[PDB]
Design a protein around this ligand. Structure first.
Ligand SMILES: [Mg+2]
Ligand SMILES: [Mg+2]
Length: 126
RNA sequence: AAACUUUCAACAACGGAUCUCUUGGUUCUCGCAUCGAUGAAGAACGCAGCGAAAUGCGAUACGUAAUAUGAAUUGCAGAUAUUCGUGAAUCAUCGAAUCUUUGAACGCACAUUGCGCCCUCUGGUAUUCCGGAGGGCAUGCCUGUUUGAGCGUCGUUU
């Protein structure tokens, strides 16, 4: 149960804050858990998904698929994986949208800011 | 006997009830004190690579600066855009700016994009005319400055 007077248990307020979330807020909302191998490598359990991460799909019809994130399509609350494509009868392929909470990050795209973020969260980066 | 009329059932119509939802409303409580001549509230007209509206903004026009953050935006397109970084996106934050024509609305006027005057600079052979750029000119009242008015009145000299 929540104790703080600054926390709201309102369903309408919580949903409004989600669907009207800014792009910067949606980066944190689109977090993904790390795989077991990366969790012991970095001592961090989840990170906001980023463009050049590699993920393994763990839920849905594409469970077991792997690929590199192509875009964190923050407007649709989804990520698009490298070769997770649906082929229309037209012959054209549209990417399949997957929520980041339904994948595990298997390889991180690292830069000076990701490492500081991992070290900020108590982990180890380099 | 058909057709026709009426009733019922099945399927299809017409229509949008019912059910289930809900970024809305309503009411209660808690906390706070912050509009404007330093130009408000409001109005009009504009502004996007491709927009009519809503939203945002003002010729720096769906925004400029700054701080933070840290890879997007996305319907399509596109960098003389970006990725171990003064660096994508961001009304995230916001302390610097821009802020058209107006509006208490202030040169005068306004059913007009009407008409002046002053200062500096500038173009046309120009203190005077015509053009342009920038800066100014409302009213009531207060304090002060300067210039004044009145046999209202004080001193002095014929
Ligand atoms: Mg209902
Ligand atoms: Mg007239």
């Amino acid at each position: 149960a929540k104790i703080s007077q600054d926390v709201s248990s309102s369903r309408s307020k919580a949903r409004k804050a989600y669907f009207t979330a800014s792009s910067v807020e949606r980066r944190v909302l689109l977090s993904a858990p790390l795989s077991k191998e990366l969790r012991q490598q970095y001592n961090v359990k989840s990170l906001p998904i980023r463009q050049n991460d590699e993920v393994l799909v763990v839920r849905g019809s594409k469970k077991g698929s792997e690929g590199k994130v192509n875009s964190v399509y923050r407007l649709k609350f989804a990520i698009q994986v490298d070769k997770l494509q649906k082929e229309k009868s037209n012959g054209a392929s549209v990417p399949i949208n997957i929520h980041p909470s339904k994948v595990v990050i298997t390889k991180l795209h690292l830069d000076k800011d990701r490492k500081a973020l991992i070290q900020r969260k108590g982990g180890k980066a380099e």
